[PDB]
Paper text:
Botulinum neurotoxins (BoNTs) are among the most toxic substances known. BoNTs block the release of neurotransmitters from peripheral nerve cells and cause botulism, a deadly paralysis requiring respiratory assistance.
To understand how residue differences within the receptor binding domain of BoNT/A1 versus BoNT/A2 may impact their receptor recognition properties, we solved a high resolution crystal structure of HcA2 in complex with human SV2C-L4. The final protein model contains one molecule of HcA2, residues 876–1295, and one molecule of SV2C-L4, residues 474–567. In the crystal, the N-terminus of SV2C-L4 forms a crystal contact and packs against the previously determined ganglioside-binding site of the neighboring HcA2 molecule in the crystal. This crystal contact is most likely the reason that Sialyl-T (ganglioside headgroup), present in the crystallization condition, was not bound. Also the rotation of SV2C-L4 causes the distance between Lys955 of HcA2 and Glu556 of SV2C-L4 to go from 3.4 Å to 7.2 Å and thus preventing formation of a salt bridge. His564 from SV2C-L4 forms a salt bridge with Glu1156 of HcA2. HcA1 uses Arg1294 to form salt bridges and a hydrogen bond to Glu539 and Ser519 of SV2C-L4 respectively, interactions that HcA2 does not possess since Ser1294 in HcA2 cannot reach those interaction partners.
Numbering used by the authors:
A (entry chain B): 473 to 567
B (entry chain A): 876 to 1295
Write the structure that this text describes.
């Protein structure tokens, strides 16, 4: 009944048409990723880094982000629905 | 007027007042290397300052008026352990009467307690949900006055903030000791910095409070964003006060490149605890000593300097060709040995022509001493290039409002907590 964990990874591929629920991502790097039609639900991101990311029709719903950085992403506030942040940072936003 | 005036002397604290208060300092009290009057107290029982007042000046009265002033720097509160947790910091309460200063999330609190254990409090509140805060982790001047027939009043940076009637309070019999100590703070990493604690035997008036503020501000010395002395040979991130949503960038090195204001500036967040712009962005500036004959490392009003700009970990020189056409002179980052006779001397300003303290300005001059202009910015095809422009100086000379030539210098500080 814990969340399924995925840790110490680097994702650098196009992720599309998929829903991830009840996941815990720890020390994960999302670098050079395009998200299209992706939703993370009820998931936790600890010490993750999103870097150079674009997202279309992509959301984080009821997710918790801790010690997480969003660098050179297009993640605007509307992409986070009912979510929360603990000691996170956004910078170099796209456009 | 003064009945206790604590200053730094010789790896120690002393009282300048006539009453010669005894001061016992614990193991783990620290003085800042640059300004030794800035005292750091940490969250340990050994980080204490105990001031023993002579009996003659112990507060014991229904009627005597009294005030206190001091400067304080309070780190940002980062997490839920900091919510809803009042902790005493300066304590003169004995047998449940006296006064104290305490803190809490976004608050500075003053408490009076009489000998029936009646209490009145005044509070300063500040938000952590602001892009750029005037208060979080910055030096703030606090003044609290008490008139036994009227009100307790709290001033912040000379400005009246909160006031409450205290004619409900009877005899207040405070302690003969003041204890400076974090007391009841559940965050093990919490600290404070304080400077220039004073006690006065009257209700200070507005003018007295403003003069204290102006006086103790050192307005001939430039300050960094945190309120510390601005320093030579120290990396600073630059904030343009008129457009705080950008940071400084350089498109290319050399006289065909230019410095400009790039956005958007980022943010740091903890849901419902803080939400602020990131401060550690852009090409850092390093102020280099040029004409000052002052042997210390502090930057003073009217110091003539050079500005080094850091671009990918290498230092270049901020300069322009004042012969370029137009009042606005676009600034470039040049190889330090290629500067030649380009204009690069900067006059650092902490105050205007009539001696009024104000935000940092940089007046670029040529090598004949002619002003080329305060450094601000101008839009060239939607790009906000840094310029020196004498229009700014003419506006300053007329007392007019300027826009974009006022800057803050931000060094990395452990009370702010962002990563660099």
């Amino acid at each position: 009944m814990e969340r399924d964990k995925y840790a110490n990874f680097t994702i650098n591929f196009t992720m599309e048409n998929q829903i991830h629920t009840g996941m815990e991502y720890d020390n994960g790097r999302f670098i050079g990723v395009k998200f299209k039609s992706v939703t993370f639900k009820d998931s936790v991101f600890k010490s993750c880094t999103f870097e150079d990311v674009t997202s279309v029709n992509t959301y984080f719903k009821n997710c918790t982000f801790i010690d997480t950085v969003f660098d050179n992403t297009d993640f605007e506030p509307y992409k986070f629905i009912d979510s929360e942040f603990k000691n996170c940072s956004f910078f170099h936003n796209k456009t | 007027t003064s009945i206790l005036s604590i200053v730094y002397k010789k790896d120690d604290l002393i009282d300048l007042s006539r009453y010669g208060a005894k001061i016992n300092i614990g193991d783990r009290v620290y003085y800042d290397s640059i300004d030794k009057n800035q005292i750091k107290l940490i969250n340990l029982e050994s980080s204490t300052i105990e001031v023993i007042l002579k009996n003659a000046i112990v507060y014991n009265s229904m009627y005597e008026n009294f005030s206190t002033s001091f400067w304080i720097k309070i780190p940002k509160y980062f997490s839920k352990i900091n919510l809803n947790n009042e902790y005493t910091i300066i304590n003169c309460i004995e047998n449940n009467s006296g006064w104290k200063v305490s803190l809490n999330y976004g608050e500075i609190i003053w408490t009076l307690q009489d000998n029936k254990q009646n209490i009145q409090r005044v509070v300063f509140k500040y938000s952590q949900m602001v892009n750029i805060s005037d208060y979080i982790n910055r030096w703030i001047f606090v003044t609290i006055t008490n008139n036994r027939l009227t009100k307790s009043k709290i001033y912040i940076n000379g400005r009246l903030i909160d006031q409450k009637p205290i004619s409900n309070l009877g005899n207040i019999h405070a302690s003969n000791k003041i204890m400076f100590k974090l007391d009841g703070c559940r965050d093990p990493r919490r600290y404070i910095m304080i400077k220039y604690f004073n006690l006065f035997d009257k209700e200070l008036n507005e003018k007295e409070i403003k003069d204290l503020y102006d006086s103790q501000s050192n307005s001939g010395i430039l300050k960094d964003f945190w309120g510390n002395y601005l320093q030579y040979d120290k990396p600073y991130y630059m904030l343009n006060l008129f457009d705080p949503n950008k940071y400084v960038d350089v498109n290319n090195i050399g006289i065909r490149g230019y410095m400009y204001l790039k956005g958007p500036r980022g943010s740091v967040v903890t849901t419902n605890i803080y939400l602020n712009s990131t401060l550690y962005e852009g090409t850092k500036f390093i102020i280099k000593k040029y004409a000052s004959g002052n042997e210390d490392n502090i930057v003073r009003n009217n110091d003539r300097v050079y500005i080094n700009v850091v671009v990918k970990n290498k230092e270049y020189r901020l300069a322009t060709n004042a012969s370029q056409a137009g009042v606005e002179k676009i600034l470039s980052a040049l190889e330090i040995p290629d500067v030649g006779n380009l204009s690069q001397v900067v006059v650092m300003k902490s105050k205007d022509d009539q001696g009024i303290r104000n935000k940092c300005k940089m007046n670029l001059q040529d090598n004949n001493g002619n002003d080329i202009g305060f450094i601000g910015f101008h839009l060239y095809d939607n790009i906000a290039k840094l310029v020196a422009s004498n229009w700014y100086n003419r506006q300053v000379g007329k007392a007019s409002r300027t826009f974009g030539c006022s800057w803050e210098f931000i060094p990395v500080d452990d009370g702010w907590g962002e990563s660099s």
